[PDB]
Amino acid sequence: SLAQFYQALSSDNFNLTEKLTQFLREGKGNVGASGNELKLSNRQIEASV
Fold first, then answer.
1. Does residue 11 contact residue 19 with C-beta atoms inside 8 Å?
2. How far is CA 11 from CA 22, 28, 42, in A?
3. SS3 annotation, 23-48
4. CB 29 within 8 A of CB 39
5. C-alpha closest to that of 36 among 26, 25, 4, 18
6. In degrees to the nearest 10, what's the CA dihedral of 19, 20, 25, 29?
7. Distance (Å, rounded) from C-alpha 40 to C-alpha 30?
């Protein structure tokens, strides 16, 4: 489960659905670290694990 995996990260943790809603409301976004990241690039959403 991606939400649980992101919430359980020791170094950089974040709430998946809250961040998704926030990045959808405004056309910018970048959270997490390299390898475990959620971002808005151009007009598309990318989630890397």
1. no
2. 21, 23, 27
3. HHHCCCCEEEECCEEEEEECCEEEEE
4. yes
5. 4
6. 70
7. 7
